[PDB]
Amino acid sequence: QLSDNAKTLHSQMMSKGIGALFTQQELQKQMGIGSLTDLMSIVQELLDKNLIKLVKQNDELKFQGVLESEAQKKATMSAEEALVYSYIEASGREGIWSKTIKARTNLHQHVVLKCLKSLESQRYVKSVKSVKFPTRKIYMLYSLQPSVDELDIEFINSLLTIVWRFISENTFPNGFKNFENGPKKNVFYAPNVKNYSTTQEILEFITAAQVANVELTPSNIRSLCEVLVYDDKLEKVTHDCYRVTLESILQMSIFNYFKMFPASKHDKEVVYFDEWT
């Protein structure tokens, strides 16, 4: 019966529905009482009546009970979105990119646009600009904003100079660059015994905040410190331990970049690195 087999077949879905992976053989696993066409006729009608739900994956076809809000929702939607919106809401967390829909849906761009505009007004979708290039405008359900990603853009080096302050302290006592010999006075006692770094410890120092942001993972810490290894703001000793390159001196023949300025006006005798090329 439409109602009876609907409600009791909706009962296995609302109760369990064998999760997402439920196939039609899994229906016979639970209800095998239904004859081949009897169970399938009401299957087809309940999808036409937007009561059962089908997913296209792996082998056979997945099924789940409708929330009935999405049911009348897509029933209100046109035949375009009926698959298109449903096809996109099957994209899950990562959503889907526009132009690849045409090869999947076999449509123009012009025809898929206006319905995407409706779903914008319907607010069941939103344009998402992800880490990859902003020519995309990939679409996912407006209900969620998951992605794969700090934020790609700036205000990082801000906290960089912060961690460099701390680890700069961590080496010898504090800067002491006022007069000629302030360093370490041979590192307290035994300028050997002291093996020092943050690793774990930094996040305890990261607790300071004074900046609007979330927390940060220990793996990402190292990913930061490596950059300063490359810039040589600090040194990498013994795995996750670290040192500083004592270029607090550049903070401030005989060789270094800073502490040097040219004439660079008039006189025709100079040294460039170009004009050999």
Partner: protein, 36 residues
């Protein structure tokens, strides 16, 4: 006009303009939806 002319008259006006107000304040709710 008197106060009743305002009320009942505005009652008719608003009565037929509440569809304009519908998308109006509905859009005002969409303003909150802009956060997400």
């Amino acid at each position: 006009l008197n106060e009743e002319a305002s009320k009942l008259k505005e009652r008719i006006w608003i009565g037929l303009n509440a569809d304009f107000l519908l998308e109006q304040e509905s859009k005002r709710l969409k303003q909150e939806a802009d956060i997400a």
